[PDB]
Amino acid sequence: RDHRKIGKQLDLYHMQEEAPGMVFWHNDGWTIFRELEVFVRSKLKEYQYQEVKGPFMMDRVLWEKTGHWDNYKDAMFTTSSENREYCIKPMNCPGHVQIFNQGLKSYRDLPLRMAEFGSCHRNEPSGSLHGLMRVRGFTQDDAHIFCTEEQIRDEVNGCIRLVYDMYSTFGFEKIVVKLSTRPEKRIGSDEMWDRAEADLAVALEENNIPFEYQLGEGAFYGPKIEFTLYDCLDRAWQCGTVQLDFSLPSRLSASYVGEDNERKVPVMIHRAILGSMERFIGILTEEFAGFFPTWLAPVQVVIMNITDSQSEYVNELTQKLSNAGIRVKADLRNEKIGFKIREHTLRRVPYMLVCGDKEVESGKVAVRTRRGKDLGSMDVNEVIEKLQQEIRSRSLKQLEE
């Protein structure tokens, strides 16, 4: 179930020598990416997050202030313009603080949950690159929550609940959690680390999550909870993550007026639920072996005619399903129906509707699935409603199975 092989076979993406670790998302792969964005956004609305977009690069000076230059320089790409040096962003946090810093903030504005599908670039050693799992350019379903110390418990718990909420949709049987503590190179005092590490351990236990410590693997700015998912060879990949930061906001001069009218520095919680779209799609591709649940399938339905006699009917049905919000395509090629069915089956299209004369006269469609199940003739409106239900619910199972 190598996602690199499935990606090629289903025409999802490709990579080349001229752009090591850089993904070229083909139409079908990009459709999956976009559907995941829709899913995340639905949750961003439910869990009350703003959504922003920061710049691709910022002056080296800013990255020096955050501690990224001294603790993360080897992973950063740099460029220049008019005698000034810039770092292509490896993280979205600094840009979020810049947005937070615009306009006076009050305790009444906290917690302020700021999300972004942020494109990050990291100069990963070429020898460590691996398909979609470890790339140099990726998009994180990132967010930074600015809050008070008293709000930490509730906000971290909210992030944890969001992870299991979203992961439940995919039916992940194996989710391993780790708590990564203070690394050798770090910012912040030992006292701050004691408190932050304790806050995350308490959160994990209060949520009934068994976890193991991963000494010295925390971020330079804070400890981190790692939600590990596994590929087909059972290799561990860090996907979701929650990090507790008491240092970056201060370094970037973030503050708010407290209920006491005094200037305070907000705590910042960093979290990514899927991790990166690239890595998450890599995990899903191997988990489903290419049989993506209908709500995620690049093409959900393909309608085929037996002969030119049913072409008009097929076009009408295709427009009807399309107007119903289904990703559907008509296959009116001059090929044998058995040839068309095999092609789409190999592409793992969830449903294939075949239209012969009896279907046209009947106003029905012959339905079969990529698994080879023959559902027989069904009423068009019946199939539309069943499909909409499967899609809307993001069900892992297809009609009857």
Added chain:
Amino acid sequence: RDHRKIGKQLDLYHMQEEAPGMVFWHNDGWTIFRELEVFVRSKLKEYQYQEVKGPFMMDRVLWEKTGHWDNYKDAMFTTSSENREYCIKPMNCPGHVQIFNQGLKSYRDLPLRMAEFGSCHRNEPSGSLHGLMRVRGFTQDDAHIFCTEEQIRDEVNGCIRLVYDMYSTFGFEKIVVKLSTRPEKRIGSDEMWDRAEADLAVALEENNIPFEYQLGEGAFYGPKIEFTLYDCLDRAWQCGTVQLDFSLPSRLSASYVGEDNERKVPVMIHRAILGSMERFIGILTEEFAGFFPTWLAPVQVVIMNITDSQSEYVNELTQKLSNAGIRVKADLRNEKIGFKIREHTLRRVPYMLVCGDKEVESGKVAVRTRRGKDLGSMDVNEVIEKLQQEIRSRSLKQLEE
């Protein structure tokens, strides 16, 4: 009228010295950006385009092959990794050709219309930067159409129709068209340029579009039909564009198998309809003076109480409108009704619903608009249906106006 002043007043975005010409999109500005993407995607579906995503950077060698290095070096940002040099993409075309080159192509695959909301970076002189109109980092609603020479007429015509189609949604009364001819520094033969320039001129005539030539302003790879829109000072800004390229495909070894079964090089049409999301939003902001059509308004409705007596009712209606897909906010502050209305009018919020005792008892709301009008009390469900229609149809006018 200035979009920079309006952008500040409505908290849409900000820019700062650590990232010259790089936009920080705040929640509200990003909401407009996203609605435009949704709008564009609805047209991509209607006009039959695929949507992809290419990498942010590629090896300098690739840019040397396309002619970008010799003819566009000054506008490109470069970076490196492991003794290799890369150029941050200033255009999406090369990446699209790389995607096209994956897998054998046949004449049956053409025309192949490939779109992308492509993030481009160009090292524009700092002195030329201007708000959202001329930036260093922007997103183009780009696309490249691969086709046969015989399909050029229809594909160019389709792009031209797409431009007026999309622009009509915004009600632009001033769209100026120019045909930009061969620049001093260019690739390709005189014969190729005469042919491409003539093809575009004929397409304009066929559509009865009056235009003027703009000498030497075409791209180094081909001539361009330029659609200019104007700002509050009546300054021209290039937005939509359609370009004919007989050079890039060949330089990047693109080809397809024709009906005769022989290797052919595809023609490529480049086109952006809005131009860049940044520049288009700048144009819209000034065109509407901040009075964004309801479908684009960051906040579409604000519901307010008179006294705490109506607070629960306001909260109920807010959730109700939110569930109906409307961008709504509640204003429960202890301020006079006039005070609240003046504030949200300055924020250009389309509708303000006032809830007094009468409203709470009758299950209605008193409607006021940002244009200083009083629409009287209306039934809540009727308001929702009407707003949904105004949004769904992307109407330029509010209720009864």
